[PDB]
């Protein structure tokens, strides 16, 4: 759900704050 919530919806840095190693 990173391209389906970003390309279609918006990704709050908080949601992308969980895609870091």
Partner 1 sequence: FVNQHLCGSDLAEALYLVCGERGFFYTKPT
Question: Which residues are at the interface with partner 1 (CB under 8 A)?
Answer: 2-3, 6-14, 16-17, 19-21
| b/e code 6-19 from CB counts within 10 Å (16+ = b) | eeeeeeeeeeeeee
CB of 15: closest distance to partner 1 in angstroms? 9
CB of 19: closest distance to partner 1 in angstroms? 5
CB of 7: closest distance to partner 1 in angstroms? 3
Cα pseudo-dihedral 12, 20, 5, 3, rounded to 10: 140
């Amino acid at each position: 759900g990173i391209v389906e919530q970003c390309c279609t919806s918006i990704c709050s840095l908080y949601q992308l704050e969980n895609y870091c190693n």
